[PDB]
Design an enzyme around this catalytic site. Structure first.
Site, PDB file in Angstrom:
ATOM      1  N   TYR A   1     -11.325  -3.538  -1.247  1.00 47.67           N
ATOM      2  CA  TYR A   1     -12.060  -3.059  -2.424  1.00 47.67           C
ATOM      3  C   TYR A   1     -12.566  -4.208  -3.288  1.00 47.67           C
ATOM      4  CZ  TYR A   1      -9.151   0.967  -1.048  1.00 47.67           C
ATOM      5  OH  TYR A   1      -8.516   1.960  -0.348  1.00 47.67           O
TER       6      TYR A   1
ATOM      7  N   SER B   1      -1.308   0.970  -1.821  1.00 46.57           N
ATOM      8  CA  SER B   1      -2.209   1.795  -1.018  1.00 46.57           C
ATOM      9  C   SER B   1      -2.596   1.056   0.266  1.00 46.57           C
ATOM     10  CB  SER B   1      -3.417   2.251  -1.866  1.00 46.57           C
ATOM     11  OG  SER B   1      -3.981   3.452  -1.363  1.00 46.57           O
ATOM     12  N   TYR B   2      -3.888   0.799   0.466  1.00 48.22           N
ATOM     13  CA  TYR B   2      -4.348   0.022   1.630  1.00 48.22           C
ATOM     14  C   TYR B   2      -3.797  -1.418   1.540  1.00 48.22           C
ATOM     15  CZ  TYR B   2      -7.806  -0.893   5.410  1.00 48.22           C
ATOM     16  OH  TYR B   2      -8.430  -1.180   6.608  1.00 48.22           O
TER      17      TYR B   2
ATOM     18  N   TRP C   1     -11.941   9.430   0.518  1.00 49.60           N
ATOM     19  CA  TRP C   1     -11.839   8.003   0.746  1.00 49.60           C
ATOM     20  C   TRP C   1     -13.073   7.437   1.469  1.00 49.60           C
ATOM     21  CZ3 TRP C   1     -10.880   4.496   4.972  1.00 49.60           C
ATOM     22  CH2 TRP C   1     -10.520   3.204   4.546  1.00 49.60           C
TER      23      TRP C   1
ATOM     24  N   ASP D   1       2.578  11.524  -4.763  1.00 48.26           N
ATOM     25  CA  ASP D   1       1.692  10.607  -4.071  1.00 48.26           C
ATOM     26  C   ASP D   1       1.554  11.077  -2.638  1.00 48.26           C
ATOM     27  OD1 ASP D   1       0.269   7.931  -4.034  1.00 48.26           O
ATOM     28  OD2 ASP D   1       1.661   7.613  -2.405  1.00 48.26           O
TER      29      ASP D   1
ATOM     30  N   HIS E   1      -1.436   9.509  -6.673  1.00 47.48           N
ATOM     31  CA  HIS E   1      -2.084   8.264  -6.268  1.00 47.48           C
ATOM     32  C   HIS E   1      -3.027   7.724  -7.332  1.00 47.48           C
ATOM     33  CE1 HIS E   1      -2.188   5.650  -2.779  1.00 47.48           C
ATOM     34  NE2 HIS E   1      -3.497   5.514  -2.899  1.00 47.48           N
TER      35      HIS E   1
HETATM   36  C1  LIG Z   1      -5.491   3.406  -0.810  1.00 46.61           C
HETATM   37  O1  LIG Z   1      -6.145   2.157  -1.186  1.00 46.61           O
HETATM   38  O2  LIG Z   1      -6.192   4.724  -1.105  1.00 46.61           O
HETATM   39  C2  LIG Z   1      -6.393   5.423   0.122  1.00 46.61           C
HETATM   40  C3  LIG Z   1      -6.015   6.877  -0.132  1.00 46.61           C
HETATM   41  S1  LIG Z   1      -6.428   7.963   1.268  1.00 46.61           S
HETATM   42  C4  LIG Z   1      -5.524   4.740   1.179  1.00 46.61           C
HETATM   43  C5  LIG Z   1      -6.193   4.539   2.545  1.00 46.61           C
HETATM   44  S2  LIG Z   1      -4.994   3.991   3.811  1.00 46.61           S
HETATM   45  O3  LIG Z   1      -5.224   3.444   0.680  1.00 46.61           O
END
Ligand SMILES: *C1(O)O[C@H](CS)[C@@H](CS)O1
Ligand SMILES: *C1(O)O[C@H](CS)[C@@H](CS)O1
Ligand SMILES: [Cl-]
Ligand SMILES: [Cl-]
Ligand SMILES: [Cl-]
Ligand SMILES: [Cl-]
Ligand SMILES: [Cl-]
Ligand SMILES: [Cl-]
Ligand SMILES: [Cl-]
Ligand SMILES: [Cl-]
Ligand SMILES: [Cl-]
Ligand SMILES: [Cl-]
Ligand SMILES: [Cl-]
Ligand SMILES: [Cl-]
Ligand SMILES: [Cl-]
Ligand SMILES: [Cl-]
Lengths: 573, 573
Positions: free
Chosen positions: A43, A116-117, A165, A258, A286
């Site tokens: 991102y 997250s990612y 996403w 989450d 989230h």
């Molecule tokens: C995060 O950065 O937000 C997304 C929610 S589906 C996820 C992708 S693995 O990671």
């Protein structure tokens, strides 16, 4: 000078195939080499403010003598190459860690942190077994991408997560432009249109026809929509089975609402015996870390405690990257926000010691349809053989309200369920009003005896705290797609009218149901768009036209020969 | 190296009295001196993530060749001295700007940016007339602290804002500890208790007895509670009257549901003739920039556009600090989020050209009490002489719902008003259902003919968009405390039963009321805790015990001789 640092932008790091990833280096003013923290970001590494408020005040790490490296993942922003989710991140992390280790300014100790990612990429880094990687801190993440966030343990597509996403990534691409294309402006608005109405975009049939998303990011169909089974395409990107063999300390963060909670918690269980694992779980979704929701407030203590998290991460990294053996003195192994009492509590383990996995059986006189039906829950097996029946029609699914929604209204986890209480396909079972508190803290599941007029359908279960003032607050939930009742890998259809005992994995919660409240369970066959709708055909759901789908007469069986129940992790302290 | 920079922490800058303020310096890798941006922060300069997400991606400014200086205000965190809100900030900014100008790395051009208190401090810096200060960018701020955020144009104490912010500052002090005191732990929790229940803390009488807040921060009583009149203590910290004499370009940001909106907008009007002023206004409240609210969503385009804001600020500073005469080419003077149509729109001025300030008169058959009463609004003067009457009892005020609330539920500006619709002290006046759109964009006020059984009371007016689906969405509102009806400086009481024509300043909005909607106005005598409750006595409100307060029989007069009305800024395009 202690506390001072410099920042070098767009340092280009060669991968094994010669494609160069871009990084920014935040390096302390230091005589010699320093421990290093790596963050792998899809991102834009330049945009630190967008994710960091969900993580740590990590500039403190730099002022205190750590270098921080933030990387653009392959194919995005300043990085070269082509972007495809997940598939390149094991190798790219391995090569990036090797490069870091080689630098003049790296003392041989590397860690990672991020959400997250930025958390998933840490499990992908951890499985390379690069010796210099001494610790990770994955927040709101998963080590199995099929189980979270794309499908789930019940084998239904998390359709809102996928479309939401993908639209976000798509908007990033239109930003992360070679040079502006003529179609960019319109595409951008159309991606906004998905984000403004995720259930509407998820409502188009066939689901697999995605002319905008499938054009911008072919992976959306090619990988995700096209592979409903937990097959080898999924298992190629899963880390989970490799986690048991690691000895890497992990500081794991999760949220009760989450999307990743089930999988975050499972990673803690998988690593805790081999390394120093830590767990922190708050009442967050989230995109909502505030502790404030439309109909439920957890207090200011519940607001993501970013400074405390920073101090904990520093203690954790001081222990594992700097050899400070006493750095984690007095830090609990597990720290949970217990809802209901709305308090943070230290624990020695997850699952908790002295968890009583207790059946609450489904019962009652007459139909359990709607909140005003006769459904009951009790620790006693039901005395007579009953069944509740409803019609599940794909054209009118039960709408998702709260829970672990990600992009479609994903900022209201503890949602009041009253808006769906008068529906005939929502079966409700509740206890008497409680006179003593009941603490439910742990993993949650249901066992239901079910039958269908159809050769495939879904069953859902949702745990609910009914307040005295009428609020019926969602806690945790899950789904079972019947073809996947025994296995996510090798599905088989069911015989119409035949009774099956199915398990529903409802993830996890921590709640004290206080005196005056009731424990409530909703049973249905849809939860849309959290999960895509079962067509009730046994076909390829994502390829079916709404008109071609069937209704199903679905039945929940309860009584002494079919003791349907929810298993609650009861804590008494 | 272009794009690279360094950060020096805790550089100590001497003020005129020899007290040293701490700053952090973010300086580009540069051959020679650079333009400089200053941020003056009471919430810890180290904690960049907490405010920046409400402002700009300002590290981009540094990568592009600006230095950024972030300062701890006097008496907080790394700074020496003693903290008192507002009183030292004119002088400390002047001395800080002088120091910046002297440095090897400053090329003689300084600007400022930042939100809230980081915005107020820019007006306090601007009035020193230091030549090197070439531009400011105050976001969600005020140049008159009596008018926002502490009291208002109607002369009622903004009690939730005061208690909420004081508790936040107090918690910061317990953090920004000499060394931890024995009482710190308990104080911290008790400050949390205020933040978790702001209306409860605002409910204690006398209001001026604040043993926790008044102990931690004496200014809460000494300045704010003790000075209900806009007297010389207020006028010593007000910048507003000095703004007309400045020639400093200002990039002004505001939110329709932001506590500071009235005063933010007024600063634009005050500077626009003498310098390049710019205005951006979104549908945000002070703590909710997301565009998402419990019962009203504005779309993802409404989410605080942090990157676009960054680009605009850079263009603005490039023009004014770097002499780039064409940098603001194609940038609108005024950019507003127009609600209802939920779209951003460029304008050439604020107030808008071709604003028709249009009376909508209060009318109807029978009582206007409650949403189901007979109250009407019309562009025609009412034909018969009526009056609506209610009892205002201080022990049961109309609760605040949405609007420009700051700390008490301040994340739901466009709140649905239905929860107070059945109350007898809420008078409702609505138009017919509209068949054509009506755009209301501009400042809003009411003129009411009123009378009271009491020698002092309040009157409130709240503009509301009633949706077809029943939602009654708050837009803007205000209050008049009767003693302050003519002047905020020299109040006088009213005679019981005597009819007065009063003005209610309802700040500003931008909304298209779409076909199918109604324009609605609520009239009452309380809005608590947005505003403190009038005691109906004419006494010193903050010193009174609830038991000593009076009820008031309040009356709204309407008809041809008493044409009570709301003035709506009508736009037809
Ligand atoms: C995060 O950065 O937000 C997304 C929610 S589906 C996820 C992708 S693995 O990671
Ligand atoms: C901003 O930082 O929040 C406060 C809301 S009352 C305000 C004080 S002037 O500045
Ligand atoms: Cl170097
Ligand atoms: Cl590539
Ligand atoms: Cl392409
Ligand atoms: Cl609550
Ligand atoms: Cl707590
Ligand atoms: Cl039957
Ligand atoms: Cl059977
Ligand atoms: Cl220097
Ligand atoms: Cl001082
Ligand atoms: Cl003191
Ligand atoms: Cl809406
Ligand atoms: Cl727009
Ligand atoms: Cl009378
Ligand atoms: Cl008269």
């Amino acid at each position: 000078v202690d506390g001072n640092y410099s920042v070098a932008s767009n340092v280009m790091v060669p991968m094994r195939d010669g494609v160069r990833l871009a990084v920014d280096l935040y390096r302390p003013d230091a005589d010699g080499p320093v421990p290093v923290l790596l963050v792998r970001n899809p991102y834009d590494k330049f945009d630190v403010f967008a994710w960091s408020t969900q993580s740590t005040n990590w500039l403190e790490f730099v002022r205190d003598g750590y270098a921080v490296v933030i990387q653009d993942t392959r194919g995005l922003f300043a990085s070269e190459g082509e972007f495809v989710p997940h598939v390149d991140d094991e190798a790219d992390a391995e090569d990036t860690l090797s490069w870091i280790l080689e630098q003049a300014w790296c003392d041989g100790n590397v860690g990672m942190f991020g959400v997250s990612y930025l958390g998933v990429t840490q499990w992908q880094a951890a499985v390379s077994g690069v010796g210099g990687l001494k610790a990770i801190a994955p927040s709101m993440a998963s080590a199995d991408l099929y189980r979270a966030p794309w499908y789930g343990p019940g084998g239904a597509l998390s359709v809102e997560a996928l479309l939401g996403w993908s639209a976000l990534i798509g908007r990033g691409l239109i930003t992360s432009r070679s040079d502006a294309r003529p179609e960019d402006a319109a595409d951008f608005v159309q991606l906004a249109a998905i984000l403004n109405d995720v259930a509407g975009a998820a409502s188009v049939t066939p689901l697999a026809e995605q002319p905008l998303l499938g054009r911008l990011i072919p992976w959306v169909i090619d990988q995700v929509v096209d592979h409903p089974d937990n097959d080898e395409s999924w298992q190629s990107i899963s880390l989970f089975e490799r986690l048991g063999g690691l000895a890497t300390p992990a500081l794991i963060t999760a949220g009760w609402y989450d999307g990743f909670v089930g999988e975050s918690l499972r990673t803690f269980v998988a690593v805790k015996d081999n390394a120093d694992a830590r767990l922190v779980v708050g009442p967050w979704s989230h995109s909502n870390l505030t502790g404030r929701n439309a109909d439920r407030k957890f207090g200011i203590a519940a607001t993501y405690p970013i400074q405390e998290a920073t101090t904990m991460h520093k203690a954790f990294f001081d222990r594992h990257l700097r050899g400070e053996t006493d750095a984690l003195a007095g830090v609990p192994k597990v720290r949970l926000f217990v809802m209901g009492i709305d308090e943070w509590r230290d624990e020695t383990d997850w699952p908790l010691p002295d968890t009583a996995y207790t059946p609450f059986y489904l019962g009652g006189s007459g139909a359990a349809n709607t909140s005003t039906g006769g459904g009951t829950l009790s620790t006693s097996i039901s005395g007579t053989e009953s069944a509740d029946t409803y019609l599940y029609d794909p054209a009118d699914p039960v709408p998702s309200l709260g829970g672990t929604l990600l992009f479609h209204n994903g900022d209201n986890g503890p949602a009041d369920q009253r808006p769906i209480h008068d529906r005939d396909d929502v079966l409700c079972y509740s206890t008497e009003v409680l006179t003593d508190p009941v603490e439910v803290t742990g993993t949650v599941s249901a066992r239901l005896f079910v039958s269908s007029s159809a050769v495939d359908t879904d069953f859902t279960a949702k745990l609910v705290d009914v307040f005295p003032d009428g609020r019926a607050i969602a806690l945790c939930d899950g789904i079972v797609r019947m073809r996947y009742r025994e296995t996510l890998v090798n599905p088989t259809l069911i015989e119409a009218g035949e009774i099956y005992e199915v398990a529903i994995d409802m993830l996890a919660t921590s709640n004290v149901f206080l005196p005056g409240h009731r424990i409530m369970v909703q049973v249905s066959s849809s939860n849309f768009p959290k999960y895509d709708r079962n067509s009730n055909t046994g076909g390829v759901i994502a390829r079916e036209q709404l008109e071609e789908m069937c209704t199903a007469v679905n039945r929940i069986h309860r009584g002494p020969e079919h003791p349907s129940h929810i298993v609650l992790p009861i804590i008494k302290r």
